[PDB]
Every structure is written in C-alpha cells, then in structure tokens.
Amino acid sequence: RTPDGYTSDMILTTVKELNGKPTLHILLIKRSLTNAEGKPNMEGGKWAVPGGFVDENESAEQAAERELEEETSLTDIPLIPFGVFDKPGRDPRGWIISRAFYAIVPPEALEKRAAGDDAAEIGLFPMTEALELPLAFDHLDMLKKAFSAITEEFLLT
Amino acid sequence: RTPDGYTSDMILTTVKELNGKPTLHILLIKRSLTNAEGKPNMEGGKWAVPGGFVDENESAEQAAERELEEETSLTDIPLIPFGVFDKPGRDPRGWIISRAFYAIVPPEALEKRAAGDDAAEIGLFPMTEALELPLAFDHLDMLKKAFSAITEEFLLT
Numbered sequence A, B: 001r002t003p004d005g006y007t008s009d010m011i012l013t014t015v016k017e018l019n020g021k022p023t024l025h026i027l028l029i030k031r032s033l034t035n036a037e038g039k040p041n042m043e044g045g046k047w048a049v050p051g052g053f054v055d056e057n058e059s060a061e062q063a064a065e066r067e068l069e070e071e072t073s074l075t076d077i078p079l080i081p082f083g084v085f086d087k088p089g090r091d092p093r094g095w096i097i098s099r100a101f102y103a104i105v106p107p108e109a110l111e112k113r114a115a116g117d118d119a120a121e122i123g124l125f126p127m128t129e130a131l132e133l134p135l136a137f138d139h140l141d142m143l144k145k146a147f148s149a150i151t152e153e154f155l156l157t
Helices: A060-072 A107-115 A139-155 B060-072 B107-115 B139-155
Strands: A005-018 A021-030 A051-053 A080-085 A096-104 A122-126 B005-018 B021-030 B051-053 B080-085 B096-104 B122-126
Touching: A005 A060, A005 A107, A005 A139, A021 A107, A021 A139, A051 A060, A060 A096, A060 A107, A080 A139, A080 B080, A096 A139, A107 A122, B005 B060, B005 B107, B005 B139, B021 B107, B021 B139, B051 B060, B060 B096, B060 B107, B080 B139, B096 B139, B107 B122
Parallel strands: A005 A096, B005 B096
Antiparallel strands: A005 A021, A005 A051, A021 A122, A080 A096, B005 B021, B005 B051, B021 B122, B080 B096
C-alpha cells in the first residue's frame, strides 16, 4: 500500500481595501459540478485553493511555482511553506498528501483572474468570508492554519 | 504514476558535554550491509536518522510519535516539523516523500540506545562529527537544515 498522490496547494493572498480598511483576501476556485465524463464531480461545487499534483520529476515547490504562473502569470514570488496536510481521509479520492504554501501578492493579478473569463468559477474573498464558504477537502483547515500564520507574521511588524 | 512512499524521519538531538563544553548531539543508526535476503542493502553501511514509513491510516506526526517510542521509550516529547524532503532521486528505492521532524530530548535515553545491544549499529554523535559521516539518502541535507533551525532557535535565547 503506497500513497495515491502528492499535491502542492497554495493559499494565495493579497491585502486590499474593504470598507476603506486594508483586509487580507484569498483567491479561491469553485470546483466544477461535473467531472470530465459529465457525471457528478467529487467535491463538486465546493471552493478550493489553487494547486495541483506534483510530478515524479519535481519538488512540491517547483509545482507550486509553476501553478502560481499558470493561474496568475506571477513569476518572482517566494512561496512560504506552512504545512503538510496528510490526515487520513482528507481527500476522498485516496491517500493524498498535500504540501501547502502561502504567498502574498499584489492585488491586481488576483483581481484579473477573479474578473476574467472564468469569473463565476473564481473569487477573491476577504478571508473572514472565505472561512464561511463551502470548502473542498480539508481546505477549511488549510485556510485557518494559513490565516493564523500570516496574521502572526503581520503582527511581528 | 503515484508516489512509492511517505516517511516520517526524525532528527533526534540532545545537549551534553564534550571536552567540558555543552554540545548538540544526534542519534543515528547505521544501515545494515545486507537486506532481508542477505544481499547487498541499498545504502548499506551508511548512517541514517531514525524513522519509518507512514501507514495509510496515520499522519506523519503519529508515525514520528510512535517511532520515537520504539527507538527510545520517550512519550511526552513534542516533535517540531522542519521540512519536507521530496527532491526527485533522494531515495533510490523510488518516489519517496519524507516529512522531517526534530526533537530535543534528555541525553540519557539516547545514551542508553547507543550503549545497548545494538551498540555497533547506533551512535550518539556531536553534530559536527555527524555531518562528516557517510550518510544515507539525503540525510546530510536533513541534518544541515535541522542543525541550522535548531541553532537559530537556541540563538533566539
């Protein structure tokens, strides 16, 4: 018995004004209602952080650097590791181990994707609102641990 | 293509006097010359940190807590995560992802194992000497990143 997958998942954040106050926002992507065959999707309709499967010939970091660019065209962004999500059962599709990173990027690239041609599918949420969404997998746990770590970094300054 | 394994690897350290100076030591375990069949062992004869494979029904943390007890009978020891070692090729046996932890324990349990009935096989090394050993897999990289993190924690006090 070996693992079914390794993923690189990204808490992608920015700071922007909500009601004239600087507020931490997160980019999230709603899972399709259907899979490729047109039947009901696992975790269908639930919001997920951006990310993807890591390839045999890369590190989770390399996969996160790539997935950052595919989703936003950002390129010179350090990704901060903040955990591993490996709790048995986290992903119903099998034994999948997630390496989780956060990044703090300028708001404009995230607004572009939330407003582009996938708009119904992508949102830029204040983090307190994101925490109340219907979230895929253990992603609520991911967001709570990221929020906490990011906040504690912001507090130290 | 999925991963071949997930491991929980432990940098197990203590502080004790070497030439009347308090020095960081590490417990390491020499890999057998042979595998179970009696033929040459992968990474045979090379020193490795304690650790083991994580089971489908546990977290890497649970596996580290267990492996701490099997190797030393310590039980109330917080394990500090310090990285993931996922670099392609790190383990010749396949695609194996390591979740790495450190712990700082009292010297006596580590001295017991280094002096017990596996004595030729187990050593408690000053960390600077451990860094020069013939080390299995990427464990040199693991020890250098642990040493660095542990030192920077000790410096903050």
